[PDB]
Write a protein that binds this ligand. Structure first.
Ligand SMILES: CCCCCCCCCCCCCCC(=O)OC(COC(=O)CCCCCCCCCCCC(C)C)COC(=O)CCCCCCCCCCCC(C)C
Ligand SMILES: CCCCCCCCCCCCCCC(=O)OC[C@H](COP(=O)(O)OCCN)OC(=O)CCCCCCCCCCCCCC
Ligand SMILES: CCCCCCCCCCCCCCCC(=O)OC[C@H](COP(=O)(O)OCCN)OC(=O)CCCCCCCCCCCCC
Ligand code: HEC
Ligand code: HEC
Ligand code: SF4
Ligand code: SF4
Lengths: 54, 25, 37, 449, 175, 54, 397, 147
């Protein structure tokens, strides 16, 4: 689910910040900008089997 | 009978919904 | 030819019960197998 | 001659066929006892072979890395292919208005179901992770994965499941009015309920018989293309593969013909004793066995034509690989099976052109036994020999079966014969109705001339 | 109170009887037989059965469901690259056999369950087993029972009509 | 009525319906148990040998 | 009798149109004439060989449908030596008569010198490997042998059923026709599979199929069944079809049309899914040449109008028990078999859907018109529907 | 068969593609083969497509590559019995082929054979649980847990 829609859960870095973070309302918008900004690859590559299983 | 169909399906519904709740117990 | 239950009063609520069976059981598999994780 | 011998009334049909079931279980004949004891012993050989298959793995078989499909897939194709002729009597002769199916179709449907139960274990058994057989079935999972559905084993799973279910359905609708007779004569009170819910209280009647013939003709119309396709798909698990002896375009009609051929051999080998030992000589006449030898002769010629097509494909082609296929089948290390194939399935079938050979019962039985053995040899030649020698000569190796392949084969014979013996005990082996209807049709032909 | 049965000996006697019956105007009857005579069924089970439209519908939707299932599974929900095979409608070969098998499966379920349901078949109890000789219906007897649902029915007039053409034994059947 | 009683029709219709419902219920049992919070140990505070407190 | 003369006149007019446009096609470019004649002879040979084989199948399997169309099957089988006389322009086409009649290359690549000669300019080794089997003397000897067996089979069965009108028939002469048809069915199967090989599958010698021939079996049988149902509708008022034939054999023949349509699409799908799924590059150029350059739309129209509509329309009772709409279905079947044999044969030398000349319509309609004219002449010379026969009572049920 | 292609340095110097041209003239009579294919595949244009190259001029039969791919990838050792059956577990094997005239003083040819990682793979189209599939990078994805 995250490897097919990474825009719903990606955050503007601050990965290790405490759990005071809340996902904003424009999660589709800011998610698409952060997906294109971090180089998050298309889901045809991230759902490949040798992505996870090896 | 049809009221037996309703009663059996409501028993199955209650027991199945209790089972669904028990899978999140 | 018609079936022998064509002119029976049970033919309305039994065949309503088959679809009320379908929309209970199949939607329960839909809830468990798609919306329950 | 006549497909039904005279001197027979509806009381006589129901008395002769109906009283082979509903006999007292302690009054059961001792020949049945001996046959069922042998079948029980071989079913225990099955259980031992399956136990050592599950514990140790599929490596107890003689399969190696070139031959990934050894004797297991051969027995699978043989056991599934036995069911074609049973479904032929069940459905195709029902469609073609053939008068010889009326005494056979119960036995034919029954051995189709039992050969299906014997075959259908082999896709589960040949895995080596057999507990994940349901992964080939499209089922809702938390993974979100699917079967590939372009594989021919993915077609096989749907194919054997649909074939098993339709042949079971045809057996049950074919059995409901004979259940209605056996309920009506059972003479023990508890057995009348048992055959009663089996019959569902069939109540043999117009506006029920109309839907009976209508649904049976129509289900025959459903199952007639179906068994052709299901054995075409059993062909297609070689015929889509890129092995030189397996990618042959003739394979689906040729496997269909080989299936009808081997199944007619098995119906011969298992109905000559049912005709002789159980006194059903009037119901299954000699003209019955004549016409069944004729249909086996038809399918044997189409199979010999398929062998010719293989020889023509290997000679006509300029490819090295088809030519070395024909050489290694003819003069290779496993070439014994191909020579026994042309002795068995080709030389021994030309006797069946002559009527006296067809009417001779010991000759007909032994020639049917050679048909079954050489049919098995044909599956060996198709699968194992083509997997022995492939494109790269470093990937060439001999296939030798172990004791466990033969153990599983004999055990599946035990499962088949056990299920057949319970069938001929509790249920009747000839359609009681549709023989009474055949008696009616015979005396009506004798009326209108 | 359910009806009156007739007990004819031979299938030809039952056929000439059922031709004599309802030519008097006694519609809505049901002849019993061990085997389909196809002449009571030709005459008084005349019409359209009802299972072929069921098998046509369910086989069509089964082939449609098998095609849609293969498409949704391998080309939409989890598009996987196998063999260099296409991921569009050009992958129509290697999608036909599961379509056919699903169509035949749903079609044969339709034929079985529709015949068993349209006949009212799963019914272990029926009134017409009350007769002292109905156990010979599946075993050598030919019955012609007419029913109380018929508009011209009355017990004294029916059983004297069923006696006029020569039976072994006519008798009323309780409910 | 020769073999079976009067409510044999009732019991047979209810039995075919009940067989369908127990097949559906057994599938529901298997699916629920394989997704259960007991099986995957979800929302279960698994006890550590020190009881660290995050 | 008189409607038979009407359909004979229509076939003669079709043959005249065909020979006129075929001679015009020789006048423009004789190679196009010869390849169109290859196609026209193949789709013309769908009638008499299927007629012969179905006559022998019904003599093996004695049915009411078989007695219903035995005489029409025997007429169609009687046209075979005239099919030899219509073959021999092809035999001139691939022999030493080349370098005359304007041909640039011979009609087959094995009939070519350079593609098979050792040390030649071409020396294509796939075609040069099969040079004993595919040489002009060998192929003419094989085809003439197959002609001899087919003419012997057909004329012997026709003469024995002509002797059946007198006597010695309720057990004699039908056992003789049964034995002759029984041996000949295997003979006919192997010889017409080999005939389909030498005529069609050797046009491109780089490719083979072992289901070819059986594909041609189903094509010939389904063309034959639709042809039989088509002119069964014309001779409805022959007074003897009204005396002994009812709509039950009509239902049987519509049933067999339906069965041969599904058997043919099973054969074509079997070849297609075998070659398509196992993507090996000696079997694949046949389907590369058949879905390229416009042939793909002919393939989809073949799948949609020769399987799906003919299957779905022929599930019902009316359109099988009724004879008029069964005739309309059969005419659509015959046209769709023409289109299918166009897809089978014409990609081997046309390379485009838009390259299909007027000769590729002239030769099928003309040679089918010759077939129909000789057929309807052969029905009229005998009484149809053999009245004295041991399989007569199945018409009376 | 056309498994190990051998040339000479003078004719390879004068024409590098002559090794295939002498093969394909005997097989097909054309200098360049035309392998038509029905299946499309994937295009792999803008992706990192991983490929292997093995020089038959350089490989000697050292067999260190087999031990390396054994050590890296946890390939188990089967006994003498399972190689007697023919069930050795080696992801890369060395093909030794002995081809030459007089066959008692022959030319010996070692060829490493790992998986070709087939873009149009016959080995993915047949396996029914979709356990060997292709990825974005074009390499065969054998999933042990789905087998
Ligand atoms: C390429 C694979 C496709 C194969 C598909 C199956 C083909 C064979 C099916 C036979 C038909 C059922 C009979 C019709 C019937 O009884 O109709 C009656 C009267 O009926 C009506 O008026 C209503 C018609 C619609 C409902 C009937 C069935 C339609 C749907 C059937 C299943 C659909 C599936 C595919 C979803 C009149 O017909 C008859 O008199 C009897 C039927 C004769 C059977 C013909 C069977 C030949 C099969 C060919 C073998 C092919 C092999 C080589 C693969
Ligand atoms: C698995 C085997 C292959 C199946 C192929 C399909 C078979 C055809 C399916 C439909 C059956 C026939 C349709 C109806 C019909 O015409 O049958 C009527 C007739 C008997 O009925 P009467 O009214 O005349 O009653 C006489 C007895 N009282 O049936 C026959 O006579 C049999 C016809 C022979 C069938 C020929 C089709 C087989 C196709 C050849 C397959 C071989 C493969 C070729 C390589
Ligand atoms: C253009 C022609 C079409 C191509 C045909 C080529 C293939 C030929 C196959 C057809 C032959 C059918 C079997 C003939 C042999 C036989 O003996 O069957 C006839 C029997 C005899 O009937 P009785 O009762 O003895 O004579 C009655 C006297 N009044 O009866 C039958 O009809 C049984 C038919 C069996 C049909 C199935 C077997 C043929 C096909 C199976 C192979 C399929 C391979 C793909
Ligand atoms: C969303 C919250 C995700 C969860 C759940 C999982 N992954 Fe993931 N992961 C995510 C993204 C957006 C990326 C990188 C995108 C890219 O450019 O590739 C990753 C990275 C991985 C990778 C790297 C492989 C690769 O990028 O090619 C893998 C193998 C990986 N994560 C493993 C993995 C596993 C096993 C997961 C289930 C527990 C998993 N990830 C979940 C986003 C998310
Ligand atoms: C990470 C994002 C993965 C991808 C891509 C794939 N697999 Fe996976 N798999 C992963 C997880 C986190 C799970 C859950 C473990 C569980 O069973 O809940 C799985 C599950 C499977 C399983 C079941 C494992 C088993 O029962 O033994 C299988 C067989 C499986 N997945 C197959 C599979 C295939 C074929 C994949 C390529 C298309 C695939 N998975 C990708 C992690 C990830
Ligand atoms: S495969 Fe073995 S012999 Fe070849 S280069 Fe690598 S290590 Fe050396
Ligand atoms: S399918 Fe893949 S792994 Fe298998 S042989 Fe071909 S390239 Fe190698």
């Amino acid at each position: 689910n995250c490897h097919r829609n990474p825009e719903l859960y990606v955050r503007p870095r601050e990965e290790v910040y405490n759990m005071d973070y809340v996902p904003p309302s424009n999660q589709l918008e800011i998610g698409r900008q952060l997906v294109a900004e971090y180089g998050i690859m298309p889901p045809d590559q991230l759902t490949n089997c040798y992505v996870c299983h090896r | 009978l049809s009221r037996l169909m309703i009663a059996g399906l409501m028993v199955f519904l209650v027991l199945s919904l209790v089972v669904l709740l028990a899978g999140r117990l | 030819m018609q079936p022998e239950w064509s002119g029976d009063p049970e033919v309305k609520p039994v065949f309503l019960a088959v679809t009320l069976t379908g929309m209970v059981a199949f939607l329960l598999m839909v809830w468990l197998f798609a919306f329950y994780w | 001659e006549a497909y039904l011998l005279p001197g027979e009334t509806y009381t006589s049909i129901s008395a002769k066929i109906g009283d082979v079931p509903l006999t007292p279980p302690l009054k059961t004949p001792k020949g049945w006892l001996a046959g069922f004891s042998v079948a029980f012993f071989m079913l225990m050989i099955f259980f031992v072979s399956v136990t050592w298959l599950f514990i140790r793995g599929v490596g107890i078989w003689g399969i190696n890395i070139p031959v990934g499909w050894g004797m297991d897939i051969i027995n699978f194709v043989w056991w599934i292919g036995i069911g074609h002729a049973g479904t032929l009597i069940s459905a195709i002769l029902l469609l073609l208005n053939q008068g010889w199916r009326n005494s056979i179709n119960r036995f034919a449907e029954a051995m189709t179901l039992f050969a299906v139960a014997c075959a259908g274990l082999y896709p589960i058994l040949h895995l080596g992770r057999p507990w994940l057989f349901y992964w080939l079935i499209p089922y809702p999972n938390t993974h979100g994965m699917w079967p590939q559905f372009r594989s021919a084993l993915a077609w096989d799973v749907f194919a054997i499941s649909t074939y098993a279910t339709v042949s079971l359905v045809f057996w049950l609708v074919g059995l409901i009015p004979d259940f209605a007779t056996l309920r009506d004569r059972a003479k023990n009170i508890w057995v009348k309920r048992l055959y009663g819910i089996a019959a569902l209280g069939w109540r043999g009647s117009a506006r029920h018989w109309h839907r009976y013939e209508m649904a049976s003709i129509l289900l025959a119309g459903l199952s007639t293309p179906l068994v052709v396709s299901v054995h075409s798909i059993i062909s297609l698990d070689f015929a889509i593969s890129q092995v030189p002896g397996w990618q042959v375009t003739v394979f689906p009609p040729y496997f269909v013909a080989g299936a009808v051929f081997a199944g007619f051999a098995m119906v011969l080998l298992l109905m000559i004793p049912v005709r002789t030992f159980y006194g059903f000589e009037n119901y299954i006449t000699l003209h019955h066995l004549d016409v069944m030898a004729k249909v086996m002769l038809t399918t044997g010629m189409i199979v010999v034509y398929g062998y010719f097509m293989e020889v023509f494909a290997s000679l006509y082609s300029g490819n090295e690989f088809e030519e070395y296929l024909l050489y290694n089948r003819l003069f290779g290390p496993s070439s014994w099976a191909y020579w026994g194939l042309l002795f068995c399935n080709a030389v021994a079938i030309q006797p069946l052109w002559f009527k006296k050979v067809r009417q001779n019962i010991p000759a007909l039985l032994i020639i049917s036994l050679i048909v079954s053995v050489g049919m098995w040899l044909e599956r060996y030649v198709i699968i194992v020999i083509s997997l022995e020698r492939d494109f790269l000569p470093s990937s060439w190796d001999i296939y030798i079966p172990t004791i466990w392949d033969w153990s599983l084969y004999i055990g599946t014979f035990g499962l088949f014969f056990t299920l057949l013996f319970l069938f001929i005990r509790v249920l009747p082996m000839i359609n009681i109705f549709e023989m009474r209807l055949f008696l009616y049709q015979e005396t009506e032909k004798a009326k209108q001339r | 109170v359910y009806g009156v049965m007739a007990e004819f000996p031979t299938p030809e006697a039952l056929i000439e009887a059922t031709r004599k019956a309802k030519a008097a105007g006694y519609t809505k009857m049901d002849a019993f037989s061990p085997f389909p005579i196809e002449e009571v069924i030709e005459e008084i089970a005349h019409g359209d059965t009802g299972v072929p439209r069921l098998v046509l519908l369910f086989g069509l939707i089964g082939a449609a469901s098998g095609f849609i299932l293969q498409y949704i599974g391998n080309l939409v929900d989890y598009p996987l690259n196998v063999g260099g095979r296409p991921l569009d409608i050009t992958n129509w070969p290697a999608m036909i056999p599961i379509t056919f098998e699903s169509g035949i499966l749903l079609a044969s379920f339709a034929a079985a369950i529709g015949m068993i349901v349209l006949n009212g078949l799963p019914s272990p109890y029926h009134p017409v087993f009350n007769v002292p000789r109905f156990q010979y219906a599946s075993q050598d007897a030919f019955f012609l029972c007419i029913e109380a649902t018929d508009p011209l029915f009355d017990r004294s007039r029916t059983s004297q009509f069923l006696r006029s053409l020569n039976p072994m034994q006519v008798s009323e059947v309780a409910y | 009525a020769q073999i079976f009683p009067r409510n044999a029709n009732l019991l047979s219709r209810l039995s075919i319906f009940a067989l369908v419902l127990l097949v559906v219920e057994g599938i529901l049992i298997l699916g629920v148990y394989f997704r259960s919070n007991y099986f995957r140990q979800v929302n279960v505070a698994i006890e550590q040998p020190v009881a660290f407190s995050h | 009798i008189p409607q038979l003369g009407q359909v004979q006149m229509l076939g003669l007019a079709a043959a005249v149109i065909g020979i006129g446009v075929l001679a015009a096609g020789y006048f423009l470019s004789p190679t196009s004439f010869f390849e169109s004649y290859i196609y026209g002879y193949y789709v013309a040979m769908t009638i008499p060989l299927g007629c012969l084989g179905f006559l022998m199948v019904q003599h093996l399997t004695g049915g009411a449908w078989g007695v219903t169309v035995r005489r029409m099957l025997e007429a169609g089988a009687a046209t075979l030596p005239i099919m030899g006389l219509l073959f021999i322009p092809i035999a001139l086409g691939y022999f030493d008569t080349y370098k005359a009649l304007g041909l640039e290359h011979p009609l087959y690549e094995w009939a070519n010198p350079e593609v098979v000669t050792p040390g030649g300019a071409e020396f294509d080794p796939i075609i040069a490997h099969k040079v004993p089997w595919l040489s002009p003397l060998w192929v003419t000897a094989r085809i003439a042998i197959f002609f001899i067996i087919w003419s012997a089979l057909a004329l012997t069965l026709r003469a024995w059923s002509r002797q059946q009108d007198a006597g010695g028939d309720a057990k004699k002469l039908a056992t003789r026709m049964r034995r002759l048809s029984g041996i000949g069915v295997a003979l006919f199967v192997i010889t017409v599979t080999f005939f389909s090989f030498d005529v069609a599958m050797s046009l491109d010698p780089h490719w083979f199929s072992t289901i070819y021939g059986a594909h041609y079996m189903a094509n010939a049988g389904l063309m034959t069944l639709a042809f039989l149902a088509l002119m069964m509708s014309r001779v409805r008022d022959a007074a003897l079809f009204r005396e002994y034939v009812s709509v039950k054999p009509i239902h049987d023949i519509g049933k067999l049309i339906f069965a041969f349509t599904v058997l043919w699409t099973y054969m074509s799908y079997g070849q297609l899914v075998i070659i398509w799924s196992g993507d090996v590059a000696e079997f694949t150029p046949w389907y590369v040449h058949r879905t390229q350059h416009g042939w793909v739309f002919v393939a989809l129209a073949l799948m949609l109008f020769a399987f799906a509509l003919p299957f779905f329309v022929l599930l019902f009772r009316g359109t099988k028990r009724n004879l008029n709409t069964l005739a309309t279905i059969a005419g659509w079947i015959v046209v769709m078999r023409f289109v299918d044999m166009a897809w089978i044969i014409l990609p081997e030398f046309r390379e485009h859907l838009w390259d299909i000349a007027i000769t590729d319509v002239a030769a099928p309609i003309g040679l089918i018109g010759l077939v129909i004219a000789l057929f309807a002449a052969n029905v009229q010379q005998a009484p149809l529907l053999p009245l004295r026969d041991p399989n007569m009572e199945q018409l009376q049920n | 068969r056309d498994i190990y292609r051998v040339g000479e340095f003078k004719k390879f110097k004068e024409d590098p593609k002559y090794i295939a041209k002498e093969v394909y003239q005997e097989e097909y009579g054309r200098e360049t083969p035309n392998y038509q294919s029905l299946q499309p595949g994937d295009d792999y244009t803008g992706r990192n497509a991983w490929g292997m190259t093995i020089n038959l001029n350089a490989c000697i039969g050292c067999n260190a590559c087999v031990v390396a791919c054994q050590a890296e990838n946890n390939i188990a050792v089967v006994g003498k019995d399972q190689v007697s059956r023919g069930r050795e577990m080696h992801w890369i094997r060395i093909d030794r082929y002995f081809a030459g005239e007089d066959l008692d003083n022959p030319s010996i040819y070692m060829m490493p054979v790992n998986c070709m990682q087939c873009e149009k793979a016959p080995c993915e189209v047949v396996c029914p649980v979709a356990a060997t599939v292709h990825d974005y990078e074009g390499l065969n994805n054998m999933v042990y847990n789905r087998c």
